[PDB]
Design an enzyme around this catalytic site. Structure first.
Site, short mmCIF file in Angstrom:
data_model
loop_
_atom_site.label_atom_id
_atom_site.label_comp_id
_atom_site.label_asym_id
_atom_site.label_seq_id
_atom_site.Cartn_x
_atom_site.Cartn_y
_atom_site.Cartn_z
N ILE A 28 80.22 157.21 53.52
CA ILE A 28 79.75 158.53 53.87
C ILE A 28 80.02 158.84 55.32
O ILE A 28 79.87 159.98 55.73
CB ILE A 28 78.27 158.78 53.50
CG1 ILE A 28 77.35 157.83 54.23
CG2 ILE A 28 78.07 158.64 52.02
CD1 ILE A 28 75.90 158.27 54.16
N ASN A 30 82.10 157.16 59.36
CA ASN A 30 82.61 156.05 60.20
C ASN A 30 82.82 156.38 61.68
O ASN A 30 82.94 157.54 62.06
CB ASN A 30 83.89 155.46 59.62
CG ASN A 30 85.06 156.38 59.76
OD1 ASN A 30 86.08 156.20 59.09
ND2 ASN A 30 84.94 157.37 60.64
N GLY A 31 82.88 155.33 62.50
CA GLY A 31 83.11 155.47 63.93
C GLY A 31 83.51 154.14 64.55
O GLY A 31 83.95 153.21 63.86
N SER A 32 83.36 154.05 65.87
CA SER A 32 83.78 152.86 66.60
C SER A 32 83.10 151.58 66.08
O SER A 32 83.75 150.55 65.90
CB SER A 32 83.51 153.05 68.09
OG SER A 32 82.12 153.24 68.31
N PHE A 33 81.79 151.67 65.84
CA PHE A 33 80.98 150.56 65.29
C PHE A 33 81.49 150.05 63.94
O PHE A 33 81.55 148.84 63.69
CB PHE A 33 79.54 151.05 65.11
CG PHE A 33 79.42 152.29 64.25
CD1 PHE A 33 79.31 153.55 64.83
CD2 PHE A 33 79.46 152.20 62.85
CE1 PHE A 33 79.21 154.69 64.05
CE2 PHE A 33 79.37 153.34 62.06
CZ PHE A 33 79.25 154.58 62.65
N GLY A 34 81.85 150.98 63.07
CA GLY A 34 82.24 150.65 61.71
C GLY A 34 81.97 151.83 60.80
O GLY A 34 82.34 152.95 61.10
N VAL A 35 81.26 151.58 59.70
CA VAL A 35 81.20 152.50 58.57
C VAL A 35 79.78 152.68 58.04
O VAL A 35 78.99 151.74 58.10
CB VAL A 35 82.01 151.91 57.40
CG1 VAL A 35 82.03 152.86 56.23
CG2 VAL A 35 83.39 151.53 57.86
N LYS A 51 74.77 150.95 57.13
CA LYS A 51 75.62 150.98 58.30
C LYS A 51 76.27 149.61 58.51
O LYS A 51 75.60 148.66 58.87
CB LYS A 51 74.76 151.39 59.50
CG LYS A 51 75.47 151.48 60.82
CD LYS A 51 74.63 152.31 61.82
CE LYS A 51 75.17 152.17 63.23
NZ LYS A 51 74.96 153.35 64.13
N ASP A 142 71.92 159.96 72.35
CA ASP A 142 72.92 160.59 71.53
C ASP A 142 72.17 161.55 70.65
O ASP A 142 72.37 161.58 69.43
CB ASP A 142 73.68 159.55 70.71
CG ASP A 142 74.97 160.09 70.16
OD1 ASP A 142 75.49 161.04 70.77
OD2 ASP A 142 75.47 159.55 69.14
C1 LIG Z 1 76.27 156.57 62.87
C2 LIG Z 1 74.99 156.33 62.11
N1 LIG Z 1 73.90 155.59 62.37
N2 LIG Z 1 73.06 155.79 61.27
C3 LIG Z 1 73.68 156.62 60.40
C4 LIG Z 1 73.07 157.09 59.14
C5 LIG Z 1 71.92 156.45 58.68
C6 LIG Z 1 71.26 156.82 57.53
C7 LIG Z 1 71.78 157.90 56.86
O1 LIG Z 1 71.32 158.50 55.69
C8 LIG Z 1 72.20 159.62 55.34
C9 LIG Z 1 73.19 159.68 56.33
C10 LIG Z 1 74.29 160.67 56.34
C11 LIG Z 1 75.61 160.22 56.30
C12 LIG Z 1 76.65 161.13 56.31
C13 LIG Z 1 76.36 162.49 56.36
S1 LIG Z 1 77.69 163.71 56.37
C14 LIG Z 1 78.32 163.99 58.04
O2 LIG Z 1 77.07 164.98 55.85
C15 LIG Z 1 75.04 162.93 56.39
C16 LIG Z 1 73.99 162.02 56.38
C17 LIG Z 1 72.97 158.59 57.33
C18 LIG Z 1 73.61 158.18 58.48
O3 LIG Z 1 74.89 156.97 60.91
#
Ligand SMILES: Cc1nnc(-c2ccc3occ(-c4ccc([S@](C)=O)cc4)c3c2)o1
Length: 341
Positions: A28, A30-35, A51, A142
């Protein structure tokens, strides 16, 4: 489909790993850290994000160390964590399906304004998570609309992504090129490294104001162009202003664009008075997240009947802890309304 089974340590509690099973893994983000993945835990049916960072093997992960200290309803909770692969640290987190970024852009794409009632709810739950985060002396660094997770149906906002949070060591300096550019506080662009948690609050302003305007208040085309954008709304920073930001640069002189007009006509008086309060040059001047909450703008949310547009009651907004109140304990009677005691 294929059920993956890992040995995982609970986020909180005693360090005693359990077998955890999950399936339906998809990427869902990704970035520098990973996925980041979405998965379904086989046994509670519950959805989670995973994560997948990359662990310095011979180094202690700061994010992991920070997530473990953390239990708050407006913060994505570290349920479990495990390792895999050379070596990846995996943070099993609350999944929440929407972000303020994506909500804010739907409205904006359709040239409408996010309902102020949502602005209130979302900003409040945001000041909350920070009051909590800051009480531990942990700066997020951030704070930006795509790190705000939202439940469409219940209006719960959870702060996420601590992949650049830091326990701030006063007397100890830090990196100044952090935050998303649009949301980056002026001192940061100024090279300061002696900074405080106010930077997060500046980011919040940046959010508050972007929710009101329907577009970033300060949209620079680069790290340095950024300050030109701040400048054209606040003017130039002066002696004790630049002093306060950091004890070099080379910019042009500009006049203080009045607040009660930087936005649009129908914008509420208090919201504008909020930003003016947040978005401030001197960093000691910005309000405290707790103190933010206090401020009027959120009063509608202190009304006993308030409900969600869909007729549900508001998510739980007054379940404070003394740990959460720590910073400024004498202010509850104006953050806890009677009906929630
Ligand atoms: C970077 C990073 N660090 N934690 C997250 C993280 C953690 C828990 C999470 O639960 C749903 C999401 C999430 C992932 C992708 C989206 S996309 C840009 O709509 C939205 C929400 C999420 C992202 O991303």
């Amino acid at each position: 489909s294929k059920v993956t089974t890992v040995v995982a340590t609970p986020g909180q509690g005693p360090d005693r790993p359990q077998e955890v099973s999950y399936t339906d893994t998809k990427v869902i983000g990704n970035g520098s850290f990973g996925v980041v993945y979405q998965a379904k835990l086989c046994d509670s049916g519950e959805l989670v994000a995973i994560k997948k960072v990359l662990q310095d093997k011979r180094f202690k992960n700061r994010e992991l160390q920070i997530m473990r200290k953390l239990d708050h309803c407006n913060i994505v909770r570290l349920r479990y964590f495990f390792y895999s692969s050379e070596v990846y640290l995996n943070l099993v987190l609350d999944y929440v399906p929407e972000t303020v970024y994506r909500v804010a852009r739907h409205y904006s794409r359709a040239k409408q304004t996010l309902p102020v009632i949502y602005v209130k709810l979302y900003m409040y739950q945001l000041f909350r998570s920070l009051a909590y985060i800051h009480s531990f002396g942990i700066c997020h660094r951030d704070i930006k609309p795509q790190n705000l997770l939202l439940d469409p149906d219940t209006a719960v906002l959870k702060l996420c992504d601590f992949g650049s949070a830091k326990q701030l060591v006063r007397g100890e300096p830090n990196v100044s090129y952090i935050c998303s550019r649009y949301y980056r506080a002026p001192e940061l662009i100024f090279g300061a490294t002696d900074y405080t948690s106010s930077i997060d609050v500046w980011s919040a302003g940046c959010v508050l104001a972007e929710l009101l305007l329907g577009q970033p208040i300060f949209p620079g085309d680069s790290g340095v162009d950024q300050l030109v954008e701040i400048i054209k709304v606040l003017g130039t920073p002066t002696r004790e202003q630049i002093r306060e930001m950091n004890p070099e640069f080379k910019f042009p002189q500009i006049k203080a664009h009045p607040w009660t007009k930087v936005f649009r006509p129908r914008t509420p008086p208090e919201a504008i008075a909020l930003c003016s309060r947040l978005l401030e040059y001197t960093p000691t001047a910005r309000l405290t997240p707790l103190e933010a909450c206090a401020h009027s703008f959120f009063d509608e949310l202190r009304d006993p009947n308030v409900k969600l547009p869909n007729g549900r009651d508001t998510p739980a907004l007054f379940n404070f802890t003394t740990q959460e109140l720590s910073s400024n304990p004498p202010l509850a009677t104006i953050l806890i309304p009677p009906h929630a005691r």
